[PDB]
Each structure stands twice: as structure tokens, then as C-alpha cells.
Short mmCIF file of N, CA and C in Angstrom, two decimals:
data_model
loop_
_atom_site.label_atom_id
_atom_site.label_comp_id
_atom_site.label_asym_id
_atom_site.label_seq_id
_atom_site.Cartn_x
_atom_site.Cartn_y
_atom_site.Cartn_z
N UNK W 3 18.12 240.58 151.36
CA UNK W 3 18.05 240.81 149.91
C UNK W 3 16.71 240.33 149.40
N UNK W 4 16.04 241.32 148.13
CA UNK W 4 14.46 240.49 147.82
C UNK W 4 14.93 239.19 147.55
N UNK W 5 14.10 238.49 147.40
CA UNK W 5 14.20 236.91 147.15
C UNK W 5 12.55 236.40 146.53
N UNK W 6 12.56 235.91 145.98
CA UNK W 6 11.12 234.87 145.03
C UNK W 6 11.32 233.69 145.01
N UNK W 7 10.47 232.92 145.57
CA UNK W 7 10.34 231.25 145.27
C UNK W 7 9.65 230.95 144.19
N UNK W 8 10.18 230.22 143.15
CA UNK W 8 9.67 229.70 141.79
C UNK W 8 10.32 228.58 141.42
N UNK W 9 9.24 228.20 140.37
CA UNK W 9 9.72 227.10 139.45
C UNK W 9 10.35 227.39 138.18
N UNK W 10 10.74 226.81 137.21
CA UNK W 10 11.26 227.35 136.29
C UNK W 10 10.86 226.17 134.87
N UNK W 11 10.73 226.29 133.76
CA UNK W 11 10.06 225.80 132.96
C UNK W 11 10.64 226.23 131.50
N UNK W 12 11.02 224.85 130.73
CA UNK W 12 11.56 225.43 129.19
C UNK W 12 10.49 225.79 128.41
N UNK W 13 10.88 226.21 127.08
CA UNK W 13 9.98 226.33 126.51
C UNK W 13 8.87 225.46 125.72
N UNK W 14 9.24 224.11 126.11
CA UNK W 14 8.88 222.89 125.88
C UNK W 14 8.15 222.35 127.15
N UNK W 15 8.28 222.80 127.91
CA UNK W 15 7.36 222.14 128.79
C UNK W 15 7.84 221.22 129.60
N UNK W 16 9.45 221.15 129.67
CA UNK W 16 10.22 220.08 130.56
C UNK W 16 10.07 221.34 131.82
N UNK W 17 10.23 220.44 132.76
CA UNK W 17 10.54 220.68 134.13
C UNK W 17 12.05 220.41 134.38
N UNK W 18 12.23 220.96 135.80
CA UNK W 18 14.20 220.94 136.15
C UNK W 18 14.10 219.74 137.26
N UNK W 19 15.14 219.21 137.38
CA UNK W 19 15.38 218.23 138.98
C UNK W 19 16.24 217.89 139.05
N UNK W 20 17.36 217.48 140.23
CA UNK W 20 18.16 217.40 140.54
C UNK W 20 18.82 215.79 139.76
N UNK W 21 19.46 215.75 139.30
CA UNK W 21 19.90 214.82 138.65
C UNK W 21 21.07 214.15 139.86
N UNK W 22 22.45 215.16 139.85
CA UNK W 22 22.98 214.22 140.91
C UNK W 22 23.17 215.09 142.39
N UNK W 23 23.71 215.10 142.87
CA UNK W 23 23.70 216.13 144.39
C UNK W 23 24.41 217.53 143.47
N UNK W 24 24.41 217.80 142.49
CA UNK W 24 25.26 219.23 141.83
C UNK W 24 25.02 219.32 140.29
N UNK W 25 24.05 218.35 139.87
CA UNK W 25 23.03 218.42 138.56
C UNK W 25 21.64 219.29 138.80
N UNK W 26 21.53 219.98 137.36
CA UNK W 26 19.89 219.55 137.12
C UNK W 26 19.79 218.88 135.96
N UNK W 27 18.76 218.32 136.23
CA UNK W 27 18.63 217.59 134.34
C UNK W 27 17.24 218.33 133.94
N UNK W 28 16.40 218.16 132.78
CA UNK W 28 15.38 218.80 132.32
C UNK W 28 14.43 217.71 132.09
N UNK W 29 13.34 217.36 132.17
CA UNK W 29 12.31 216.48 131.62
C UNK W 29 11.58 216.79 131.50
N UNK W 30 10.08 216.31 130.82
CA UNK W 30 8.94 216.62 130.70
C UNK W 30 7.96 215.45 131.71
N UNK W 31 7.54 216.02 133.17
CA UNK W 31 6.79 215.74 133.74
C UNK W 31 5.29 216.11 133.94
N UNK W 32 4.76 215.21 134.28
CA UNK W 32 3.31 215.81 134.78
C UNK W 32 3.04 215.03 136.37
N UNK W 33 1.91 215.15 136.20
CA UNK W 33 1.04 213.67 137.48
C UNK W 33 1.39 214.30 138.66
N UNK W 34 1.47 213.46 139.98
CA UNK W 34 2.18 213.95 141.08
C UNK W 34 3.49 213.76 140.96
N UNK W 35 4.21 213.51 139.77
CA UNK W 35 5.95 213.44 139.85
C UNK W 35 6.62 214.36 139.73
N UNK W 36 5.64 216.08 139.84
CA UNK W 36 5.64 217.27 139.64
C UNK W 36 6.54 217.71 140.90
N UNK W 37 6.23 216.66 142.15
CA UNK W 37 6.83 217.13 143.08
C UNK W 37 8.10 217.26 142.93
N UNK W 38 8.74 216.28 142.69
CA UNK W 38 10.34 216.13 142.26
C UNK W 38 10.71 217.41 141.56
N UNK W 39 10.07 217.96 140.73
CA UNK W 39 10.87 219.42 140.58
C UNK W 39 11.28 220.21 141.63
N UNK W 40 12.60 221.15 141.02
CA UNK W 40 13.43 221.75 141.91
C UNK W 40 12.77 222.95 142.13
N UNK W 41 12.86 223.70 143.51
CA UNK W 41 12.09 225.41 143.73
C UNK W 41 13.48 225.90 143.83
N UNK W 42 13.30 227.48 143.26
CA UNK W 42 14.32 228.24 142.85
C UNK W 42 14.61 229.13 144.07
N UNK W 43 15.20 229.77 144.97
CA UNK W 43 15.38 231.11 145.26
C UNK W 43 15.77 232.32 144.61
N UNK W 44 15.24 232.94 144.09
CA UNK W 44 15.84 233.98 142.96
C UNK W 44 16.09 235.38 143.72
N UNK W 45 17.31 235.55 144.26
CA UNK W 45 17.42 236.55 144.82
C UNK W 45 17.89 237.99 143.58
N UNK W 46 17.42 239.02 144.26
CA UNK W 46 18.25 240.50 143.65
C UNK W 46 19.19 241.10 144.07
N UNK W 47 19.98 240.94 143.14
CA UNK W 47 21.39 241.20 143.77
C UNK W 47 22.05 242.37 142.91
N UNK W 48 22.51 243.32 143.43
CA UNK W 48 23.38 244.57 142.69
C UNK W 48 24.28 243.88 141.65
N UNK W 49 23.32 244.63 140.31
CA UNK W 49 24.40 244.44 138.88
C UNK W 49 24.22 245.87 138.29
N UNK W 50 23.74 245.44 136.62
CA UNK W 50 23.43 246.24 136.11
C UNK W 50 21.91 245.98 135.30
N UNK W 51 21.22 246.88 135.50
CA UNK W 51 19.89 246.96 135.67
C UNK W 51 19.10 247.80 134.63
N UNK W 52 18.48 247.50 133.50
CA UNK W 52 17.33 247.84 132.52
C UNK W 52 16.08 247.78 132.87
N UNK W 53 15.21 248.40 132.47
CA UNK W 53 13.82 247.54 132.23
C UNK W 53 13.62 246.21 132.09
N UNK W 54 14.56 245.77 130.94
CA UNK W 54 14.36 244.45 130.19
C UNK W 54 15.30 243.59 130.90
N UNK W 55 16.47 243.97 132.15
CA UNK W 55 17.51 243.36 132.10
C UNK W 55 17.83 243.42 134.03
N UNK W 56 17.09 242.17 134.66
CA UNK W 56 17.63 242.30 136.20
C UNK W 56 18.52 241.22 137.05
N UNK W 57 19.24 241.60 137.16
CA UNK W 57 20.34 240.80 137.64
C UNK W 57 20.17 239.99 138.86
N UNK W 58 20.35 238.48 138.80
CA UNK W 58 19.49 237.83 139.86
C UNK W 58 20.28 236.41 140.40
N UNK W 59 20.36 236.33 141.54
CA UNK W 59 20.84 234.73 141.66
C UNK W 59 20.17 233.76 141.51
N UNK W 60 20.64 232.48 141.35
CA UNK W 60 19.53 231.57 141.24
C UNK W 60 19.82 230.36 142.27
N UNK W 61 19.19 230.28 143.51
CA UNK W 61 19.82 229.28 145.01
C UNK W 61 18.58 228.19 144.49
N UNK W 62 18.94 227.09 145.39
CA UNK W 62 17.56 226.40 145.79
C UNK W 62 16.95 226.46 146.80
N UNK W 63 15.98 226.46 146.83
CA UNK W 63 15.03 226.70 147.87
C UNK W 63 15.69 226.57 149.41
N UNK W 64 15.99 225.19 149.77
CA UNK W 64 16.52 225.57 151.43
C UNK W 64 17.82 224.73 151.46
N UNK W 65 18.84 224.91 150.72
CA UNK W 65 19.70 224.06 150.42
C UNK W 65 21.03 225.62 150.08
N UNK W 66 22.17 225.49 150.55
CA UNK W 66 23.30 226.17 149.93
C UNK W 66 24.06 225.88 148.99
N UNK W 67 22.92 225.64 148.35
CA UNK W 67 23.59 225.46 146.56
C UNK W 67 22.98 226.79 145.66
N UNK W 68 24.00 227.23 145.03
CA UNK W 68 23.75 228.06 143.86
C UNK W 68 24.04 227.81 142.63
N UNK W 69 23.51 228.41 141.34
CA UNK W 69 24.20 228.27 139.81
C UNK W 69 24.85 229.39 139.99
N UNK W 70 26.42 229.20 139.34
CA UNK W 70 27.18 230.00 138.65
C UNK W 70 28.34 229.27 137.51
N UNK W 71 28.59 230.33 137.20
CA UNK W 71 29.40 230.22 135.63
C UNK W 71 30.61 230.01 135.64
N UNK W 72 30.93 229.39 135.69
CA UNK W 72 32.52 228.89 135.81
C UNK W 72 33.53 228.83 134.16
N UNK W 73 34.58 229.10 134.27
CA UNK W 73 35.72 228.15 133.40
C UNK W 73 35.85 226.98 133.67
N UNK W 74 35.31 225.65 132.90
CA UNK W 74 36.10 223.99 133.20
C UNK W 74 36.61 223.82 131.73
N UNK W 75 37.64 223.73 131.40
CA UNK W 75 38.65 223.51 130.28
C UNK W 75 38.00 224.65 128.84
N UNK W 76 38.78 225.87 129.63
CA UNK W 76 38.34 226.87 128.51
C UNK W 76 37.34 226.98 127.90
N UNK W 77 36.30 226.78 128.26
CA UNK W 77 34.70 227.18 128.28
C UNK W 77 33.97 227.22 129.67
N UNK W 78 32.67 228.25 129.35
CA UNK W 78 31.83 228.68 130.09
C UNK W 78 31.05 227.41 130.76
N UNK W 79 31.05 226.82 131.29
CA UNK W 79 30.32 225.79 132.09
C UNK W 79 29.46 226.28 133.28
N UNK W 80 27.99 225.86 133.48
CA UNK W 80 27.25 225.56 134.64
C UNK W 80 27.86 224.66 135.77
N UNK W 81 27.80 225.43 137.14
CA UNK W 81 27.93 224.45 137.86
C UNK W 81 26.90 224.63 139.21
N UNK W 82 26.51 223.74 140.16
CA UNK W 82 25.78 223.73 140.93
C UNK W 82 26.75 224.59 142.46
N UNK W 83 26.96 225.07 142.61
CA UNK W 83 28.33 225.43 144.55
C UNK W 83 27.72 225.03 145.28
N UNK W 84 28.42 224.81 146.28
CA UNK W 84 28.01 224.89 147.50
C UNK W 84 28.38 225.88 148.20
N UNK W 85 27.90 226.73 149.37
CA UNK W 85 28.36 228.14 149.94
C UNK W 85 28.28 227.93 150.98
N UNK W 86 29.10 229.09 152.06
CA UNK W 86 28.81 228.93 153.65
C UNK W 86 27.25 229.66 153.66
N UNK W 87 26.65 228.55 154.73
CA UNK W 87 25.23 228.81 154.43
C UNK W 87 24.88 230.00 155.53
N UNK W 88 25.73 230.75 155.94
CA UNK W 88 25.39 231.86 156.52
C UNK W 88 25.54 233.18 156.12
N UNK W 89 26.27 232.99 155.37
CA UNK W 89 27.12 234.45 154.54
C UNK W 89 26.21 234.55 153.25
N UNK W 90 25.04 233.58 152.58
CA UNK W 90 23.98 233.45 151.44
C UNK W 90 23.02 233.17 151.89
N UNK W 91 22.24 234.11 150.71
CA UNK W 91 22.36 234.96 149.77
C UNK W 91 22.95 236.30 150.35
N UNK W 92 23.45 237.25 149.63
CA UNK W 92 23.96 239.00 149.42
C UNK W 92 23.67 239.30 148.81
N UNK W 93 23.42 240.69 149.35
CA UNK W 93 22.96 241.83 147.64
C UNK W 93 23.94 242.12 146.72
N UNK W 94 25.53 242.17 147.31
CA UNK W 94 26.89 241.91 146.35
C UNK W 94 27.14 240.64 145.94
N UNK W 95 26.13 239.68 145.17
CA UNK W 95 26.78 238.30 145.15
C UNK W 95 28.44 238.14 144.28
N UNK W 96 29.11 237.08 143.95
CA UNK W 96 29.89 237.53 143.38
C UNK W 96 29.91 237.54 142.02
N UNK W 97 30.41 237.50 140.92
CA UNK W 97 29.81 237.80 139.81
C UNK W 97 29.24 236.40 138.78
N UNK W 98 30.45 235.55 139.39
CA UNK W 98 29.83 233.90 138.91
C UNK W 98 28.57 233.43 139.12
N UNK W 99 27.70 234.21 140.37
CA UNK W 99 26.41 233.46 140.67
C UNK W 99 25.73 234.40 140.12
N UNK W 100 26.11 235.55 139.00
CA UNK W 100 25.35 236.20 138.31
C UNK W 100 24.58 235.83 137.37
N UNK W 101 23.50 236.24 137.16
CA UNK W 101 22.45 235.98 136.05
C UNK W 101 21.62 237.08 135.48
N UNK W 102 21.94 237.74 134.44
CA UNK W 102 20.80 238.55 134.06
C UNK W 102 19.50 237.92 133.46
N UNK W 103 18.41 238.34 134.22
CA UNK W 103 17.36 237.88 133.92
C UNK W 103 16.25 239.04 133.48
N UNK W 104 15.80 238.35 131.26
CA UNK W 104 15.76 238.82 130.30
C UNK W 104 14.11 238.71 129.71
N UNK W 105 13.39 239.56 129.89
CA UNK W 105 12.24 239.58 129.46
C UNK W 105 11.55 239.64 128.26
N UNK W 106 11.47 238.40 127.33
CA UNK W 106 11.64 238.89 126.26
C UNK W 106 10.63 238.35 125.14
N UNK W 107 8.87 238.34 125.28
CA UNK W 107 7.84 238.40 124.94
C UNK W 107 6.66 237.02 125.94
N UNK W 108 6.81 237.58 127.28
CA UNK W 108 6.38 236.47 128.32
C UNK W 108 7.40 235.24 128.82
N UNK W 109 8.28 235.18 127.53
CA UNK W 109 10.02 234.61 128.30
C UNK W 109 10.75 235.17 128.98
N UNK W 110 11.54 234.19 129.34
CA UNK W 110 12.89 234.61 129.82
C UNK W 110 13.98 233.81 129.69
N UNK W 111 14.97 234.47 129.99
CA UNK W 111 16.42 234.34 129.35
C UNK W 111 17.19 234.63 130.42
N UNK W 112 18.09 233.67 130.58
CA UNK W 112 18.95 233.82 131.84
C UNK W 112 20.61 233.72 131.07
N UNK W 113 21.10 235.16 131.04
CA UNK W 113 22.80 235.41 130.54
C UNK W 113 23.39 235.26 132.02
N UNK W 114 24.77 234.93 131.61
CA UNK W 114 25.76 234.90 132.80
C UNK W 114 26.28 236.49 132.42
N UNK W 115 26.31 237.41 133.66
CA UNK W 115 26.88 238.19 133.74
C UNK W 115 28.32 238.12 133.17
N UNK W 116 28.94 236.81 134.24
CA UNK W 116 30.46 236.20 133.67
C UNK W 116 30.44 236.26 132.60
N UNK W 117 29.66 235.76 131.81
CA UNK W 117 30.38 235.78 130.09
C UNK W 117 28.99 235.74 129.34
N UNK W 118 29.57 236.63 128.55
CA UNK W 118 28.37 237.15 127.87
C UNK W 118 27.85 236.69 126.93
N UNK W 119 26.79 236.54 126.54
CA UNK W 119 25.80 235.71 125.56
C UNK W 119 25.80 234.21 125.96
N UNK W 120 26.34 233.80 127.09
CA UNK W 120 26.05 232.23 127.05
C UNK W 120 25.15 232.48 128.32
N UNK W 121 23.93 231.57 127.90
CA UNK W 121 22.35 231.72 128.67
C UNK W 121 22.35 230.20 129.17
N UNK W 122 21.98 230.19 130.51
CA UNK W 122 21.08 228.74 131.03
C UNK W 122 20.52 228.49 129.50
N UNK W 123 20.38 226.98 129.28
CA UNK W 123 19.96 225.80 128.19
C UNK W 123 19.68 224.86 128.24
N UNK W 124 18.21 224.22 128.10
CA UNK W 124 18.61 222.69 128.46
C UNK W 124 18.16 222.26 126.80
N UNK W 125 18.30 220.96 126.85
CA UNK W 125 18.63 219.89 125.59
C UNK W 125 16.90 219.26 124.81
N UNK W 126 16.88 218.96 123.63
CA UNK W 126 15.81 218.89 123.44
C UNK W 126 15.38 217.48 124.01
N UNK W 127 15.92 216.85 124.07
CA UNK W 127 15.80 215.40 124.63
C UNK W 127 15.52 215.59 125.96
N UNK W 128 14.99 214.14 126.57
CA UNK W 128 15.04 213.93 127.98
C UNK W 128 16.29 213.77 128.55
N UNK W 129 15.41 214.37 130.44
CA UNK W 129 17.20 213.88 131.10
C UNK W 129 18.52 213.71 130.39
N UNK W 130 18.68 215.34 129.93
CA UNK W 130 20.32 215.73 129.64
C UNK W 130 20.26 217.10 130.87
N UNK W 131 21.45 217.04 131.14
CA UNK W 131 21.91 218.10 131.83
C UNK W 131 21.43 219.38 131.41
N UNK W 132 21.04 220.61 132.44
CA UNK W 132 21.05 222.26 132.15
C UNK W 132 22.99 222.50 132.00
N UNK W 133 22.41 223.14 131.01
CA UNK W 133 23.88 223.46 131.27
C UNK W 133 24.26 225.39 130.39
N UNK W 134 25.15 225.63 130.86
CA UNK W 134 25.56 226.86 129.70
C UNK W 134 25.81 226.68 128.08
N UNK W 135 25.07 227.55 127.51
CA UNK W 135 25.16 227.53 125.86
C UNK W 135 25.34 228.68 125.32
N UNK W 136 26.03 229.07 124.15
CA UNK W 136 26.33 230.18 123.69
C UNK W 136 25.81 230.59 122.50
N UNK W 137 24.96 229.91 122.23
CA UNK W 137 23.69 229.88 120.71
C UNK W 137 22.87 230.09 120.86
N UNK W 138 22.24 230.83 120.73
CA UNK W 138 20.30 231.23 121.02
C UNK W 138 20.46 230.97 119.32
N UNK W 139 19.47 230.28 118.93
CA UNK W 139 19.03 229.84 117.90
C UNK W 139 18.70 228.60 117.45
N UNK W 140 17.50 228.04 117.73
CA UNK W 140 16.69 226.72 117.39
C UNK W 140 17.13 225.32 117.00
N UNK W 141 18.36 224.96 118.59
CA UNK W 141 19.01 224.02 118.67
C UNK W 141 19.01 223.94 120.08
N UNK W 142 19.28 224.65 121.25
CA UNK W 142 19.31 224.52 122.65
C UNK W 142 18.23 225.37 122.47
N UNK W 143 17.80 224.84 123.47
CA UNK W 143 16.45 226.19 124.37
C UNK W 143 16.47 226.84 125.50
N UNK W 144 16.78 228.18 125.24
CA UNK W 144 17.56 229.13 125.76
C UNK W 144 16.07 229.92 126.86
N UNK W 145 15.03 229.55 126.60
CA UNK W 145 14.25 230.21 127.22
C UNK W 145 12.97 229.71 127.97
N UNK W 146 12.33 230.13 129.10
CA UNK W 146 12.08 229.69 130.41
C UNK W 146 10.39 230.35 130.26
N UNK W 147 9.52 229.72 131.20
CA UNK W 147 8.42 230.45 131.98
C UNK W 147 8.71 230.04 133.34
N UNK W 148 8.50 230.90 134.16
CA UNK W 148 8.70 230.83 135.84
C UNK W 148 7.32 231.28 136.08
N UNK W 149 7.01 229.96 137.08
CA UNK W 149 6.03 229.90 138.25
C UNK W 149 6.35 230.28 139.52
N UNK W 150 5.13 230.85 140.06
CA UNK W 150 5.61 231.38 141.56
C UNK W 150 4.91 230.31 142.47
N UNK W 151 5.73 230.11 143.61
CA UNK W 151 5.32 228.94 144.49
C UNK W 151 5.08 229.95 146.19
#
């Protein structure tokens, strides 16, 4: 399946990193503590597909962990999986490790296929969790620049 190694970046300028073995948290780093950021695998995986709109997983780099969208007490929640690391990535992923990924003036915007309108978010503060949000509007920050590594 294609696949891209990247970084990923709010619109603030925090960086992502693993907070606990199945976190990310968001901060604003620089220096060499740059390393500690997380690399993405962004695979392409069969959804549904626009110009503006490509459907994508999001793994870590050499690790069988993925984001997908779960139900934890009747809401949309982020969670980190773990997968059999032979059977991932697929071009049929299943629909939880879905992400449409949203182009939308040098941003991007990551929707859960699973449920709609709630986008990857992280917090304006330091070290709070990424997590799923269902507000695009100038309280979570719903939108990303990705670096290629």
C-alpha cells in the first residue's frame, strides 16, 4: 500500500510525542528535543476519495500502533491499537483506522471516516493529550502542517 513518512505539526507550532506507550500529547518544542517527536506512517488506503478529500491511515513509523476512532462511553474517542504486525498496514484498512485527510488552504484536517465531523485536535496548552473533537472553531485546533522525513 503507498505509505509517507512524516511529521505532523498544529497550527501553533506544537509538535506530537508519545506521552504514555498509547498517548500522544502535543507541545511546543525546538533544540535537539525535536528528536522526541513522533514519525507518522501515512498509508492510502481504499475509502472515498475527492480532490480535497484522501483517505489515509495514520501508523507510527516502525511500531504496530495505529490511530483509530473508537466509542469509550458514548463518544468518539482517539485511541492509539496495537495490530498483528504482519497483517499492517492494508489497502482495506478497517474503517476505525480511517482518516480523511483534508486540504484546506496549505492545512490539513484529519476527519474520522467513523464519525463524521470529529477531526484529530490537540489543546491549546502544553502536554494535553491529541485527542478527537467535534468543533472546528477557535477553541481546539483542528488543523496540521506535515513534514516529510
Amino acid at each position: 500500500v503507498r505509505s509517507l513518512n512524516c511529521t505532523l505539526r498544529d497550527s501553533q507550532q506544537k509538535s506530537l510525542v508519545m506521552s504514555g506507550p498509547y498517548e500522544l500529547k502535543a507541545l511546543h518544542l525546538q533544540g535537539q528535543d525535536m528528536e522526541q517527536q513522533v514519525v507518522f506512517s501515512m498509508s492510502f488506503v481504499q475509502g472515498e476519495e475527492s480532490n480535497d478529500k484522501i483517505p489515509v491511515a495514520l501508523g507510527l513509523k516502525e511500531k504496530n500502533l495505529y490511530l483509530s476512532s473508537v466509542l469509550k462511553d458514548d463518544k468518539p474517542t482517539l485511541q492509539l491499537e496495537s495490530v498483528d504486525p504482519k497483517n499492517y498496514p492494508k489497502k482495506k484498512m478497517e474503517k476505525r483506522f480511517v482518516f480523511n485527510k483534508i486540504e484546506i488552504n496549505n492545512k490539513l484536517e484529519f476527519e474520522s471516516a467513523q464519525f463524521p465531523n470529529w477531526y484529530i485536535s490537540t489543546s491549546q496548552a502544553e502536554n494535553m493529550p491529541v485527542f478527537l473533537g467535534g468543533t472546528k472553531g477557535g477553541q481546539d485546533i483542528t488543523d496540521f502542517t506535515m513534514q516529510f522525513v
